[PDB]
Design a protein around this motif. Sequence first.
Motif, PDB file in Angstrom:
ATOM      1  N   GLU A 555       0.813  -1.203   0.000  1.00  0.00           N
ATOM      2  CA  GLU A 555       0.000   0.000   0.000  1.00  0.00           C
ATOM      3  C   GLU A 555       0.855   1.264   0.000  1.00  0.00           C
ATOM      4  O   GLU A 555       1.913   1.299   0.623  1.00  0.00           O
ATOM      5  CB  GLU A 555      -0.914  -0.014   1.219  1.00  0.00           C
ATOM      6  CG  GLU A 555      -1.995   1.050   1.218  1.00  0.00           C
ATOM      7  CD  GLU A 555      -2.975   0.869   2.363  1.00  0.00           C
ATOM      8  OE1 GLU A 555      -3.504  -0.260   2.523  1.00  0.00           O
ATOM      9  OE2 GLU A 555      -3.214   1.854   3.100  1.00  0.00           O
ATOM     10  N   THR A 587       3.070   2.886   2.725  1.00  0.00           N
ATOM     11  CA  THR A 587       2.330   2.501   3.924  1.00  0.00           C
ATOM     12  C   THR A 587       2.619   1.062   4.317  1.00  0.00           C
ATOM     13  O   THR A 587       2.991   0.781   5.450  1.00  0.00           O
ATOM     14  CB  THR A 587       0.821   2.635   3.702  1.00  0.00           C
ATOM     15  OG1 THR A 587       0.450   4.005   3.861  1.00  0.00           O
ATOM     16  CG2 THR A 587       0.040   1.755   4.689  1.00  0.00           C
ATOM     17  N   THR A 588       2.425   0.149   3.375  1.00  0.00           N
ATOM     18  CA  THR A 588       2.669  -1.259   3.622  1.00  0.00           C
ATOM     19  C   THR A 588       3.625  -1.753   2.557  1.00  0.00           C
ATOM     20  O   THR A 588       3.337  -1.653   1.365  1.00  0.00           O
ATOM     21  CB  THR A 588       1.372  -2.091   3.527  1.00  0.00           C
ATOM     22  OG1 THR A 588       0.341  -1.471   4.305  1.00  0.00           O
ATOM     23  CG2 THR A 588       1.612  -3.506   4.044  1.00  0.00           C
ATOM     24  N   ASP A 589       4.766  -2.281   2.984  1.00  0.00           N
ATOM     25  CA  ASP A 589       5.742  -2.801   2.040  1.00  0.00           C
ATOM     26  C   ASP A 589       6.847  -3.614   2.710  1.00  0.00           C
ATOM     27  O   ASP A 589       7.374  -3.251   3.767  1.00  0.00           O
ATOM     28  CB  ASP A 589       6.338  -1.656   1.217  1.00  0.00           C
ATOM     29  CG  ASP A 589       6.953  -2.139  -0.071  1.00  0.00           C
ATOM     30  OD1 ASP A 589       8.114  -2.597  -0.038  1.00  0.00           O
ATOM     31  OD2 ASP A 589       6.264  -2.076  -1.113  1.00  0.00           O
ATOM     32  N   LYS A 593       9.092   1.172   3.464  1.00  0.00           N
ATOM     33  CA  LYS A 593       8.107   1.494   4.484  1.00  0.00           C
ATOM     34  C   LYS A 593       8.560   2.849   4.962  1.00  0.00           C
ATOM     35  O   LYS A 593       9.723   3.011   5.329  1.00  0.00           O
ATOM     36  CB  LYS A 593       8.199   0.491   5.636  1.00  0.00           C
ATOM     37  CG  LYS A 593       7.156   0.637   6.731  1.00  0.00           C
ATOM     38  CD  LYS A 593       5.797   0.159   6.270  1.00  0.00           C
ATOM     39  CE  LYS A 593       5.028  -0.504   7.404  1.00  0.00           C
ATOM     40  NZ  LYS A 593       4.797   0.411   8.551  1.00  0.00           N
TER      41      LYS A 593
END
Length: 705
Positions: A555, A587-589, A593
Motif C-alpha cells: 500500500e 504505507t505497507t511494504d 516502508k
Amino acid sequence: ESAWGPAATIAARQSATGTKTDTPIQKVPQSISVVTAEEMALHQPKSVKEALSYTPGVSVGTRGASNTYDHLIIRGFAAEGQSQNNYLNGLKLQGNFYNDAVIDPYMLERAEIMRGPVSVLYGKSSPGGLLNMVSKRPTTEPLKEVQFKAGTDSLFQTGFDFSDSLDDDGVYSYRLTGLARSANAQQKGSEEQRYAIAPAFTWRPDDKTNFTFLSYFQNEPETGYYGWLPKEGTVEPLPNGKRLPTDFNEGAKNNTYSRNEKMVGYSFDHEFNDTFTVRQNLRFAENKTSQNSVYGYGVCSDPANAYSKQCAALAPADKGHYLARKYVVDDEKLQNFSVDTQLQSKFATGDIDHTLLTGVDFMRMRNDINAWFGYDDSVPLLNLYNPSHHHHHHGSVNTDFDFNAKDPANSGPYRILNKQKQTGVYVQDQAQWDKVLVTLGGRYDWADQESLNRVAGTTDKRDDKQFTWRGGVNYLFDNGVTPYFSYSESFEPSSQVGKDGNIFAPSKGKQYEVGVKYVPEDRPIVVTGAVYNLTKTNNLMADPEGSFFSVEGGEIRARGVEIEAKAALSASVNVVGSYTYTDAEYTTDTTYKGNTPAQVPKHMASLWADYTFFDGPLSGLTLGTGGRYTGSSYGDPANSFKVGSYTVVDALVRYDLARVGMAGSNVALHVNNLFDREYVASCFNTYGCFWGAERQVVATATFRF
Ligand code: NI
C-alpha cells in the motif's frame, strides 16, 4: 488583447474530460487543468509535457532530455509498468511495453490533465491522473498557416495548418495539419526525426449534428536518446571527483530507435431534442516501434552488477568508475480499437435540474513483441574517466556494436503477444439544486487480458470484474468562489504473475479531496486550491522471503496540496503559476516502508509572466519569462540517496509581425534553461539517472496567409 490573454483564460473555463459532459471547471468536483492552443502557440512546447509545465501535481521532466515518450508522474503515481496513461479525444491511446504513441502538440487544440482517480468514467486507470489531448478540428473561419523553425542542436522544423469550408454554409469543412522536424539529440550521436500529417473532416448537416473524422499519421525514423546513467558521474562525483557531461551518450554509435503511428476515427454528437443528446467517440490505431539499443546499467561497484564477470575482473577500487552496459533489440506492432457511446439526458425534478449521463465504453488492444535482451557481460564496459574537462569542451561518441550474433551465453529472446479488452458501463448524474451541484456516478468494468509467451510457449490469462464510483459536491456561489469536496475510486489490473503461476489481483485507488475554485465570471482570472488524500492499495511488493516473485497487499499513500493560478493582471501582463506539495509514502511494504517513492519531490512550483507592448515603437512586442522549481527527490525505492532540487528559467521574445502588413503572422525567439543550468532531472534507481535539458534556442516564424 493578445490571443493567449483573457480569450484563453475564459475558453479554459469549459472542459469535459472531468465529467464527459460539457461542464465549466468550477462545476467539476475534481482537480482539472486546461492548456489552450493559444497558450501552446505562445510557449512553443516541444511535447505535451512542457505544455503542462505550469500546472500542479505533475512532474513533466522526469526523463530529462529524452523526448521519446510523454510520461507523466501525477500526484506521485504512474500507470502499471510505467506505461503512459494518455488519452486523445476521450479515448485512450492504449500502448504496451515500448509501444506507446505520442501526439505532436502542433496537432492539438488543447490538453487537459485530470488528477486523482477517474475510473468512474474511463475504466482501468492509474490512480493520480490521466492526460487528455484534443485534436485540432476544422475551423469556421479560413486558416492558411505555415511555420518555420530554426534552433540549436540543428533543430529545423517546417509545418502547415490549413482549414477551410467546402460550402458557403459550412456543412462540409476540413483541416490538414502537418510537420517535418529533425534535430540532433542533447547526447552526441543521437538524432531526432519526425514526419506528421493529421487529416480532419467535419460534417454539420444541421446545427444539432456533428460528425468529425479524425486521423493522425506519424513516422519517426529516429526517436533519440532513451538511455540510463549511473548516479556516479551525474548526481554524485566519480572517484576522480569529476562528472559525466550532460551530452554524454553511453549507447552504441549504431543505436537506433523508431516509431510508427497511424490512426483513423471520429467524434460524433447529435442533439435529438431538448432532453436527449447522443455522442459517440471511436478510433482505431496501428502503431509500431523498433530499436537497437545499448544502455547503461550502473557502475561496476553497483549492487546490480555483483554477478557481472567483466566487473569482478577489475580492481576493487576501479569498480566505481567503470560502466556496466546491456542492450535490447525490439520490434513491435499493435492495433488498438476504441468506442465510447454515451446518452446524455437533461431534465428537472422540481427545482432539481439533472444531467444524467449513461454510456458504454469498449476497447481492445493487441501488441506483438519480438525482442532480444542482453544480460550481464553482453556488451563492453566503459571507463568514465576519459570524460573529463576536455569533453565538457566537445563530446565524443562511442563505438558500434553487433546487435546480431545474439550470443546465447549473455543474451536471450523475448517474444510476447499481449491482449487486453475492457468493456464498461457507467452512469453519472449532475444534479443542480440552485447554488448546489452534486456529482455522483459509478461504473462497472470487464477488463480481461491474455499473454502468450512464444518463447516459453505458455499462456497467462485473467478477467477482472471491477466497480468504481465517485461522488462530490460543488457549492456554486455568485461572487466567484466555488467550494467543493469529493470521493473517487480507480482500479488497475496487474500483468505480473505470482509464485502460484497466476495473474495478481488489480490495485485500487481511493481519494478524498476538498478545495475551493475561484472562477469569477466578471474578471479574466482563475484560481484553484485543493488538498487530497490518495491511497493505492494492493500494490505489488517483495516476497517476505526472497523468491523472485512479488506479493500483493502492499500500500502507498500520497497526500498533498495544489494551487494553480492564471490571470491577466493588466492589458499587457498575463501570469500563470502553481505550487505543489506532495507527501508520498510507502504505507505497507516488505522492503520499503516510510520511504517515499523515487522521482517524486515533496515540493514543486512554477510561475510565468508575459508583457506585451501596445505603446511606443515597441508595439506588438511580447516579452515573457518563467521559472520552474523542482524540489529534491529520492533516486531509488530504498531511498539510499537523493537527487537535488533545481530551478530552470525560460524566456521568449515575440513580435506581432502584424505591423509590417503581414497580420496574424509573427516571429519568435525561445530560449529554454536560459542560465544553461546543469542538473539531473531525476533517477528511478542508482543506475537509472537522467541529465536535465541543456539550454536550447529556437527561432520560429509562423505565417498566416
Ligand atoms: Ni475477440
